[PDB]
Amino acid sequence: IVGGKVCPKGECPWQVLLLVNGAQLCGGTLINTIWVVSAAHCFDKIKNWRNLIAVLGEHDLSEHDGDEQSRRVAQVIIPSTYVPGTTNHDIALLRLHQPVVLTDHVVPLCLPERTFSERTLAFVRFSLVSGWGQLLDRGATALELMVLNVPRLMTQDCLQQSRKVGDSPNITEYMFCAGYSDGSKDSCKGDSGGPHATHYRGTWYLTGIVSWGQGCATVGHFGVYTRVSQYIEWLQKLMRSEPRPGVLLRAPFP
Amino acid sequence: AFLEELRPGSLERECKEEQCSFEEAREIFKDAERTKLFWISYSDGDQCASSPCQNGGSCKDQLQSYICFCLPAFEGRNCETHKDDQLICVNENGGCEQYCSDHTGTKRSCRCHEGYSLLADGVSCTPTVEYPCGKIPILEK
Amino acid sequence: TVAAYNLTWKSTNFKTILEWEPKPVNQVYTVQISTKSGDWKSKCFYTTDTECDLTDEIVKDVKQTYLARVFSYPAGGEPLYENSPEFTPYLETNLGQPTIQSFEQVGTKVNVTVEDERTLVRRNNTFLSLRDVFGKDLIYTLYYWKSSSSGKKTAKTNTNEFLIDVDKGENYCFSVQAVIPSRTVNRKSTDSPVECM
Ligand SMILES: C[C@H](NC(=O)CC(=O)Nc1ccc(C(=N)N)cc1)c1ccc(Oc2cccc(C(=O)O)c2)c(Br)c1
Ligand SMILES: *[C@H]1O[C@H](CO)[C@@H](O)[C@H](O)[C@H]1O
Ligand SMILES: *[C@@H]1O[C@@H](C)[C@@H](O)[C@@H](O)[C@@H]1O
Ligand SMILES: [Ca+2]
Ligand SMILES: [Ca+2]
Ligand SMILES: [Ca+2]
Ligand SMILES: [Ca+2]
Ligand SMILES: [Cl-]
Ligand SMILES: [Cl-]
Ligand SMILES: [Mg+2]
């Protein structure tokens, strides 16, 4: 996160830290005791599928405390439509092998219904983005969880206000822009998979996933996020599915 | 009535009580600027004569137009919009705290996410579990 | 669908209506309005009108800067839309036509009173006047003259009243304007109807 603040311990209780072979991989969002939502692109280079861990209650990566809970990732479900190395359909649904225990430091973020997210949450101006990613474009990552408030844009505005970049990726109906084009504040590579959480009448909801952008806090550019409202029915059906022998599942979309 | 034309020039008798032409008013004011000052409003007419303000609203004439002052339950240029007929889910979530469902032929209903239940007011949601989704316990949920 | 165009703000004494083109064919509109950092509020839901009264939203804070947008929806994911110009009611609303409430001769002087100009801004059950809203920013100007004058005289006030010197045995005529001197454009209202002694 560039230009954000340290999220005070326990104030981002749905943030997930994903590890592979014990090394930081990506962020994620807990949505109930068993299921985590992250970005599909986080898994493009995975070879050791049995070495994926989700850590909940994490705050300071340099110190362990009794609020951290680790769980093995049993399943990684990605839309069959997603193409490794590209931006569209950047979402992954992860099944934990055993549920986490809900505490003052570990709480899920609400996955909203589609129509409520489209007609109400989409028009709440600001939402929070968080993670242990880079504090500056191509710089070092963060030791303490960072958080930033970003305003959302309709795609027509995002295209009209962004500096043209030759052959840049299309911003599809499965994405949305949020952030600032003045080079001051944005999410960054290391925050991928993390939540874009929206506060509405006393409850927080999952509206986006940190996905991509042109650099990080680059003048003339906004952060691009996976548009979670497009996947509600897909996620709900998959959360009711039976576990399979292998970890990776490329599930049909829609 | 030619006998009324014997009376001297009067803004009240010629323009106020009866309708006067620009020339008749110009003979009273004499100066071109003073006659324009009078003419711009008097010739403009009263757009409030058609009683455009509905639902108990009040009309105030303006130059080639009017403004309607509405009672609190109404809005619109002519107070035609009934605020009480706008309880739909695209209007501030239909007043629901969490989910809103439109029901054509009847009123909308409010619903809650899993881990919450609807209160007796028909709009508010309360937790049914110790750690409901989307609440931050250290900030006293 | 086709996007709305020629979005124009029509505002007098804070009664504020957004207007646009074209007249809809197999499409309906919804308007949204926000301040630069606030949430978007929807109004005029699925209307076939080419106008939307936004008075109730702008009167929440007349000094804020509002942006509106008109969404086009087909009769049968994000819709086509067009943004309006920015609108700051306090700086841009037209000042309404004033009315001379009364005039009285007090000997060799005349007091001229301007009626309180009603606005669409409410303060619990009552409509605020233009002076309630603008305060020191609002002045009234008076044009006055006798039948045989070589033009007209001007007086200005920080209240709604003028006290002018008059010649004995001369009948005077009056006209008033609401003025926001600090403005550069849309500084004055239209003139009140003329009243004579
Ligand atoms: C989805 C995937 N993401 C990543 O790798 C991590 C990443 O970019 N993280 C990040 C998070 C936030 C910000 C931020 N908010 N500034 C920046 C970076 C990604 C994949 C391909 C990309 O480019 C192409 C190239 C060719 C074809 C196409 C094609 O889609 O056709 C797209 C991009 Br660009 C991003
Ligand atoms: C009065 O009549 C109609 C409403 O019935 C309105 O359109 C006019 O502008 C007004 O003078
Ligand atoms: C004009 O104002 C409206 C709001 C109502 O109070 C009417 O009764 C009045 O004449
Ligand atoms: Ca730690
Ligand atoms: Ca008379
Ligand atoms: Ca003549
Ligand atoms: Ca008129
Ligand atoms: Cl486990
Ligand atoms: Cl006033
Ligand atoms: Mg005559």
mmCIF file of N, CA and C in Angstrom, chain B residues 1-84:
data_model
loop_
_atom_site.group_PDB
_atom_site.id
_atom_site.type_symbol
_atom_site.label_atom_id
_atom_site.label_comp_id
_atom_site.label_asym_id
_atom_site.label_seq_id
_atom_site.Cartn_x
_atom_site.Cartn_y
_atom_site.Cartn_z
ATOM 1 N N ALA B 1 -63.863 54.341 -24.114
ATOM 2 C CA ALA B 1 -64.642 55.504 -23.696
ATOM 3 C C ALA B 1 -63.784 56.753 -23.828
ATOM 4 N N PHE B 2 -64.043 57.571 -24.864
ATOM 5 C CA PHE B 2 -63.244 58.767 -25.097
ATOM 6 C C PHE B 2 -63.266 59.750 -23.914
ATOM 7 N N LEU B 3 -64.362 59.794 -23.115
ATOM 8 C CA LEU B 3 -64.402 60.708 -21.962
ATOM 9 C C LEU B 3 -63.375 60.357 -20.872
ATOM 10 N N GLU B 4 -62.877 59.113 -20.838
ATOM 11 C CA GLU B 4 -61.846 58.739 -19.865
ATOM 12 C C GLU B 4 -60.458 59.191 -20.327
ATOM 13 N N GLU B 5 -60.307 59.484 -21.620
ATOM 14 C CA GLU B 5 -59.041 59.947 -22.181
ATOM 15 C C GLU B 5 -58.788 61.440 -21.903
ATOM 16 N N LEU B 6 -59.805 62.149 -21.389
ATOM 17 C CA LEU B 6 -59.664 63.546 -20.992
ATOM 18 C C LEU B 6 -58.856 63.639 -19.695
ATOM 19 N N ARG B 7 -58.890 62.591 -18.848
ATOM 20 C CA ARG B 7 -58.158 62.534 -17.596
ATOM 21 C C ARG B 7 -56.652 62.518 -17.887
ATOM 22 N N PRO B 8 -55.848 63.203 -17.061
ATOM 23 C CA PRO B 8 -54.394 63.231 -17.305
ATOM 24 C C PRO B 8 -53.729 61.862 -17.190
ATOM 25 N N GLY B 9 -52.546 61.732 -17.789
ATOM 26 C CA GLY B 9 -51.759 60.504 -17.764
ATOM 27 C C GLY B 9 -51.540 59.939 -16.371
ATOM 28 N N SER B 10 -51.898 58.668 -16.180
ATOM 29 C CA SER B 10 -51.791 58.029 -14.876
ATOM 30 C C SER B 10 -51.320 56.588 -15.015
ATOM 31 N N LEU B 11 -50.214 56.235 -14.337
ATOM 32 C CA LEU B 11 -49.711 54.864 -14.355
ATOM 33 C C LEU B 11 -50.745 53.911 -13.749
ATOM 34 N N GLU B 12 -51.407 54.342 -12.664
ATOM 35 C CA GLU B 12 -52.428 53.547 -12.002
ATOM 36 C C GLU B 12 -53.647 53.277 -12.894
ATOM 37 N N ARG B 13 -54.274 54.323 -13.432
ATOM 38 C CA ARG B 13 -55.467 54.153 -14.262
ATOM 39 C C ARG B 13 -55.182 53.491 -15.620
ATOM 40 N N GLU B 14 -54.081 53.866 -16.290
ATOM 41 C CA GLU B 14 -53.751 53.301 -17.605
ATOM 42 C C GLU B 14 -53.058 51.938 -17.583
ATOM 43 N N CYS B 15 -52.092 51.737 -16.678
ATOM 44 C CA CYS B 15 -51.338 50.488 -16.638
ATOM 45 C C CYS B 15 -51.780 49.527 -15.525
ATOM 46 N N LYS B 16 -52.027 50.015 -14.302
ATOM 47 C CA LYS B 16 -52.445 49.135 -13.201
ATOM 48 C C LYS B 16 -53.858 48.547 -13.381
ATOM 49 N N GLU B 17 -54.889 49.402 -13.449
ATOM 50 C CA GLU B 17 -56.275 48.955 -13.615
ATOM 51 C C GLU B 17 -56.569 48.350 -14.997
ATOM 52 N N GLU B 18 -55.987 48.919 -16.060
ATOM 53 C CA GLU B 18 -56.195 48.411 -17.415
ATOM 54 C C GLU B 18 -54.838 48.044 -18.003
ATOM 55 N N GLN B 19 -54.797 47.303 -19.123
ATOM 56 C CA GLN B 19 -53.523 46.933 -19.735
ATOM 57 C C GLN B 19 -53.021 48.041 -20.672
ATOM 58 N N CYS B 20 -51.795 48.544 -20.446
ATOM 59 C CA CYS B 20 -51.249 49.607 -21.288
ATOM 60 C C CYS B 20 -50.205 49.104 -22.272
ATOM 61 N N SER B 21 -50.073 49.801 -23.404
ATOM 62 C CA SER B 21 -49.083 49.464 -24.424
ATOM 63 C C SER B 21 -47.714 50.071 -24.034
ATOM 64 N N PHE B 22 -46.627 49.670 -24.727
ATOM 65 C CA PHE B 22 -45.302 50.215 -24.423
ATOM 66 C C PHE B 22 -45.277 51.732 -24.598
ATOM 67 N N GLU B 23 -45.891 52.241 -25.687
ATOM 68 C CA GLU B 23 -45.942 53.675 -25.956
ATOM 69 C C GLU B 23 -46.667 54.453 -24.873
ATOM 70 N N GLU B 24 -47.837 53.972 -24.451
ATOM 71 C CA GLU B 24 -48.589 54.620 -23.380
ATOM 72 C C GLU B 24 -47.709 54.717 -22.123
ATOM 73 N N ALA B 25 -46.994 53.631 -21.767
ATOM 74 C CA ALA B 25 -46.117 53.655 -20.586
ATOM 75 C C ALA B 25 -44.941 54.605 -20.801
ATOM 76 N N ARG B 26 -44.385 54.627 -22.024
ATOM 77 C CA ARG B 26 -43.270 55.504 -22.397
ATOM 78 C C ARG B 26 -43.650 56.974 -22.287
ATOM 79 N N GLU B 27 -44.903 57.329 -22.582
ATOM 80 C CA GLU B 27 -45.325 58.726 -22.441
ATOM 81 C C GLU B 27 -45.367 59.136 -20.968
ATOM 82 N N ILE B 28 -45.583 58.174 -20.059
ATOM 83 C CA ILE B 28 -45.598 58.428 -18.624
ATOM 84 C C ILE B 28 -44.162 58.582 -18.095
ATOM 85 N N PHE B 29 -43.278 57.611 -18.380
ATOM 86 C CA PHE B 29 -41.907 57.632 -17.870
ATOM 87 C C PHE B 29 -40.952 58.546 -18.624
ATOM 88 N N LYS B 30 -41.219 58.794 -19.916
ATOM 89 C CA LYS B 30 -40.462 59.653 -20.843
ATOM 90 C C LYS B 30 -39.064 59.112 -21.216
ATOM 91 N N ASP B 31 -38.227 58.778 -20.229
ATOM 92 C CA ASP B 31 -36.894 58.242 -20.471
ATOM 93 C C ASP B 31 -36.999 56.801 -20.977
ATOM 94 N N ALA B 32 -36.122 56.422 -21.913
ATOM 95 C CA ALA B 32 -36.125 55.073 -22.481
ATOM 96 C C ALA B 32 -35.722 54.014 -21.451
ATOM 97 N N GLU B 33 -34.774 54.348 -20.565
ATOM 98 C CA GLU B 33 -34.286 53.426 -19.539
ATOM 99 C C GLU B 33 -35.325 53.161 -18.470
ATOM 100 N N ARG B 34 -35.996 54.221 -17.999
ATOM 101 C CA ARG B 34 -37.043 54.102 -16.991
ATOM 102 C C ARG B 34 -38.225 53.299 -17.532
ATOM 103 N N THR B 35 -38.561 53.484 -18.821
ATOM 104 C CA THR B 35 -39.658 52.730 -19.419
ATOM 105 C C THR B 35 -39.286 51.247 -19.530
ATOM 106 N N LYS B 36 -38.014 50.930 -19.820
ATOM 107 C CA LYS B 36 -37.554 49.537 -19.907
ATOM 108 C C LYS B 36 -37.629 48.882 -18.531
ATOM 109 N N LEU B 37 -37.233 49.612 -17.479
ATOM 110 C CA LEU B 37 -37.280 49.157 -16.085
ATOM 111 C C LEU B 37 -38.715 48.758 -15.716
ATOM 112 N N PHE B 38 -39.700 49.539 -16.178
ATOM 113 C CA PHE B 38 -41.095 49.228 -15.927
ATOM 114 C C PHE B 38 -41.564 48.073 -16.809
ATOM 115 N N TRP B 39 -41.228 48.137 -18.111
ATOM 116 C CA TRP B 39 -41.686 47.225 -19.151
ATOM 117 C C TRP B 39 -41.209 45.781 -19.011
ATOM 118 N N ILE B 40 -39.960 45.553 -18.599
ATOM 119 C CA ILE B 40 -39.435 44.194 -18.487
ATOM 120 C C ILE B 40 -40.297 43.291 -17.584
ATOM 121 N N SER B 41 -40.778 43.805 -16.442
ATOM 122 C CA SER B 41 -41.616 43.002 -15.551
ATOM 123 C C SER B 41 -43.112 43.030 -15.886
ATOM 124 N N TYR B 42 -43.664 44.202 -16.208
ATOM 125 C CA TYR B 42 -45.099 44.335 -16.473
ATOM 126 C C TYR B 42 -45.551 43.584 -17.741
ATOM 127 N N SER B 43 -44.722 43.562 -18.798
ATOM 128 C CA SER B 43 -45.073 42.857 -20.044
ATOM 129 C C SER B 43 -44.856 41.349 -19.972
ATOM 130 N N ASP B 44 -43.962 40.913 -19.075
ATOM 131 C CA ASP B 44 -43.564 39.531 -18.848
ATOM 132 C C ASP B 44 -44.732 38.582 -18.556
ATOM 133 N N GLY B 45 -45.775 39.093 -17.917
ATOM 134 C CA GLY B 45 -46.923 38.269 -17.571
ATOM 135 C C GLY B 45 -46.689 37.403 -16.349
ATOM 136 N N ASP B 46 -47.771 36.848 -15.807
ATOM 137 C CA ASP B 46 -47.727 36.027 -14.614
ATOM 138 C C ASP B 46 -47.806 34.547 -14.982
ATOM 139 N N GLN B 47 -46.676 33.816 -14.922
ATOM 140 C CA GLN B 47 -46.705 32.376 -15.201
ATOM 141 C C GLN B 47 -47.456 31.586 -14.103
ATOM 142 N N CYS B 48 -47.621 32.175 -12.899
ATOM 143 C CA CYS B 48 -48.349 31.550 -11.798
ATOM 144 C C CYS B 48 -49.882 31.586 -12.006
ATOM 145 N N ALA B 49 -50.388 32.272 -13.062
ATOM 146 C CA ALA B 49 -51.831 32.349 -13.328
ATOM 147 C C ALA B 49 -52.438 30.977 -13.650
ATOM 148 N N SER B 50 -51.647 30.072 -14.241
ATOM 149 C CA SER B 50 -52.103 28.718 -14.552
ATOM 150 C C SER B 50 -52.103 27.779 -13.337
ATOM 151 N N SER B 51 -51.749 28.278 -12.131
ATOM 152 C CA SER B 51 -51.638 27.498 -10.894
ATOM 153 C C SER B 51 -50.819 26.209 -11.110
ATOM 154 N N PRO B 52 -49.540 26.336 -11.497
ATOM 155 C CA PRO B 52 -48.757 25.132 -11.819
ATOM 156 C C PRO B 52 -48.347 24.298 -10.619
ATOM 157 N N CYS B 53 -48.317 24.894 -9.416
ATOM 158 C CA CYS B 53 -47.845 24.169 -8.241
ATOM 159 C C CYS B 53 -48.908 23.255 -7.663
ATOM 160 N N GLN B 54 -48.637 21.959 -7.701
ATOM 161 C CA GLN B 54 -49.567 20.933 -7.249
ATOM 162 C C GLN B 54 -49.370 20.601 -5.780
ATOM 163 N N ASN B 55 -50.285 19.777 -5.233
ATOM 164 C CA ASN B 55 -50.188 19.235 -3.895
ATOM 165 C C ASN B 55 -49.963 20.280 -2.798
ATOM 166 N N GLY B 56 -50.666 21.397 -2.914
ATOM 167 C CA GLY B 56 -50.612 22.438 -1.900
ATOM 168 C C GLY B 56 -49.390 23.333 -1.926
ATOM 169 N N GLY B 57 -48.631 23.295 -3.016
ATOM 170 C CA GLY B 57 -47.443 24.129 -3.156
ATOM 171 C C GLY B 57 -47.771 25.590 -3.422
ATOM 172 N N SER B 58 -46.749 26.460 -3.378
ATOM 173 C CA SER B 58 -46.893 27.902 -3.591
ATOM 174 C C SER B 58 -46.062 28.424 -4.751
ATOM 175 N N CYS B 59 -46.687 29.213 -5.625
ATOM 176 C CA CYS B 59 -46.030 29.724 -6.811
ATOM 177 C C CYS B 59 -45.493 31.125 -6.613
ATOM 178 N N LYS B 60 -44.290 31.370 -7.122
ATOM 179 C CA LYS B 60 -43.704 32.697 -7.099
ATOM 180 C C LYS B 60 -43.250 33.025 -8.517
ATOM 181 N N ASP B 61 -43.828 34.085 -9.077
ATOM 182 C CA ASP B 61 -43.517 34.506 -10.426
ATOM 183 C C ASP B 61 -42.052 34.933 -10.575
ATOM 184 N N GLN B 62 -41.461 34.620 -11.732
ATOM 185 C CA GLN B 62 -40.100 35.017 -12.092
ATOM 186 C C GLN B 62 -40.124 35.551 -13.553
ATOM 187 N N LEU B 63 -38.978 35.984 -14.104
ATOM 188 C CA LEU B 63 -38.965 36.495 -15.475
ATOM 189 C C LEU B 63 -39.034 35.319 -16.447
ATOM 190 N N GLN B 64 -40.172 35.206 -17.164
ATOM 191 C CA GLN B 64 -40.506 34.161 -18.142
ATOM 192 C C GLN B 64 -40.577 32.757 -17.525
ATOM 193 N N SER B 65 -40.824 32.667 -16.222
ATOM 194 C CA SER B 65 -40.853 31.390 -15.524
ATOM 195 C C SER B 65 -41.465 31.587 -14.121
ATOM 196 N N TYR B 66 -41.338 30.586 -13.250
ATOM 197 C CA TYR B 66 -41.840 30.643 -11.894
ATOM 198 C C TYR B 66 -41.052 29.642 -11.044
ATOM 199 N N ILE B 67 -41.224 29.700 -9.733
ATOM 200 C CA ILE B 67 -40.659 28.712 -8.823
ATOM 201 C C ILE B 67 -41.776 28.189 -7.911
ATOM 202 N N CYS B 68 -41.815 26.865 -7.687
ATOM 203 C CA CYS B 68 -42.777 26.257 -6.786
ATOM 204 C C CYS B 68 -42.096 25.910 -5.468
ATOM 205 N N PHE B 69 -42.719 26.321 -4.381
ATOM 206 C CA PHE B 69 -42.300 26.022 -3.018
ATOM 207 C C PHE B 69 -43.206 24.863 -2.614
ATOM 208 N N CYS B 70 -42.640 23.674 -2.385
ATOM 209 C CA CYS B 70 -43.452 22.502 -2.068
ATOM 210 C C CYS B 70 -43.644 22.265 -0.581
ATOM 211 N N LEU B 71 -44.715 21.524 -0.214
ATOM 212 C CA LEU B 71 -44.909 21.063 1.157
ATOM 213 C C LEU B 71 -43.851 19.946 1.385
ATOM 214 N N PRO B 72 -43.471 19.627 2.640
ATOM 215 C CA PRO B 72 -42.381 18.661 2.861
ATOM 216 C C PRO B 72 -42.469 17.288 2.176
ATOM 217 N N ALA B 73 -43.667 16.741 1.949
ATOM 218 C CA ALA B 73 -43.790 15.416 1.325
ATOM 219 C C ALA B 73 -43.723 15.443 -0.204
ATOM 220 N N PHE B 74 -43.409 16.600 -0.812
ATOM 221 C CA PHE B 74 -43.415 16.725 -2.268
ATOM 222 C C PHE B 74 -42.188 17.395 -2.835
ATOM 223 N N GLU B 75 -41.851 17.054 -4.077
ATOM 224 C CA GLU B 75 -40.757 17.688 -4.798
ATOM 225 C C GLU B 75 -41.127 17.760 -6.303
ATOM 226 N N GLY B 76 -40.242 18.284 -7.122
ATOM 227 C CA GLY B 76 -40.497 18.465 -8.542
ATOM 228 C C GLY B 76 -40.686 19.936 -8.868
ATOM 229 N N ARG B 77 -40.501 20.298 -10.133
ATOM 230 C CA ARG B 77 -40.713 21.667 -10.621
ATOM 231 C C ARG B 77 -42.120 22.179 -10.248
ATOM 232 N N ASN B 78 -43.118 21.281 -10.305
ATOM 233 C CA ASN B 78 -44.507 21.619 -9.988
ATOM 234 C C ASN B 78 -45.034 20.914 -8.738
ATOM 235 N N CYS B 79 -44.139 20.461 -7.842
ATOM 236 C CA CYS B 79 -44.497 19.692 -6.640
ATOM 237 C C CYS B 79 -45.289 18.427 -7.019
ATOM 238 N N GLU B 80 -45.035 17.863 -8.215
ATOM 239 C CA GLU B 80 -45.775 16.693 -8.706
ATOM 240 C C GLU B 80 -45.280 15.382 -8.110
ATOM 241 N N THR B 81 -44.020 15.332 -7.670
ATOM 242 C CA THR B 81 -43.443 14.103 -7.126
ATOM 243 C C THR B 81 -43.833 13.865 -5.672
ATOM 244 N N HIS B 82 -44.479 12.730 -5.390
ATOM 245 C CA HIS B 82 -44.842 12.374 -4.034
ATOM 246 C C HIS B 82 -43.674 11.596 -3.420
ATOM 247 N N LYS B 83 -43.036 12.149 -2.377
ATOM 248 C CA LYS B 83 -41.937 11.439 -1.706
ATOM 249 C C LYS B 83 -42.375 10.085 -1.144
ATOM 250 N N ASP B 84 -43.635 9.984 -0.709
ATOM 251 C CA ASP B 84 -44.164 8.746 -0.135
ATOM 252 C C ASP B 84 -44.310 7.597 -1.145
#
